[PDB]
Amino acid sequence: IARTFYDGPEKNYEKTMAILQIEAEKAELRLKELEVRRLMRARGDGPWYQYPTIDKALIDHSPKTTPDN
Amino acid sequence: GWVRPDLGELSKVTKVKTDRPLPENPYHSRARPEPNPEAEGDLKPAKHGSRLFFWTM
Numbered sequence: 001i002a003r004t005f006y007d008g009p010e011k012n013y014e015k016t017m018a019i020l021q022i023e024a025e026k027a028e029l030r031l032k033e034l035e036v037r038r039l040m041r042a043r044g045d046g047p048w049y050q051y052p053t054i055d056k057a058l059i060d061h062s063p064k065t066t067p068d069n
Numbered sequence: 070g071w072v073r074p075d076l077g078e079l080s081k082v083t084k085v086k087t088d089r090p091l092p093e094n095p096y097h098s099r100a101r102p103e104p105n106p107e108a109e110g111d112l113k114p115a116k117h118g119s120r121l122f123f124w125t126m
């Protein structure tokens with residue numbers, strides 16, 4: 001029965017090791033992403049949560065019929 | 070010996086020679102804040118996929 005239907009314990013052991021490594025890395029990445037989201041939304045100094053401002057290319061830099069703009 | 074200007078001459082844009090230096094900050098502007106740095110590097114696939122609950126892709 002063992003020879004026909006089942007493998008040795010090492011296969012399940014090392015597959016468990018691989019699964020545990022993947023899951024632990026995913027958990028750490030989730031916590032890191034939450035912290036990064038919090039910091040980026042608080043400071044606004046990252047790529048995320050960038051809200052539009054007025055384009056400076058819309059300004060007319062011409063004499064304006066009055067010396068003081 | 071004065072000659073009256075012709076039509077369209079007083080409205081010309083002329084050039085003037087002056088020794089007055091060109092002002093550098095006529096608006097009295099402050100120093101502009103520095104921008105967010107940049108996006109750099111090559112794009113790699115997301116580590117372990119979406120990582121959304123039970124999904125492995």
Ligand SMILES: CCCCCCCCCCCCCCCCC[C@@H](O)O[C@H](CO[C@H](O)CCCCCCCCCCCCCCC)COP(=O)(O)OCC[N+](C)(C)C
Nearest residue numbers: 001002003004005006007008009010011012013014015016
């Ligand atoms: C000889 C008498 C004394 C001893 C009697 C012992 C009784 C044992 C027989 C009863 C069957 C046990 C249940 C079967 C469960 C096994 C299913 C699965 O886990 O096994 C697969 C093996 O597949 C087998 O083909 C299972 C087939 C069993 C299906 C039973 C069908 C019986 C139906 C009855 C029909 C009779 C006639 C009908 C007339 C209409 C594994 O696939 P594999 O990916 O390789 O695994 C790798 C492991 N290796 C490396 C060791 C190979």
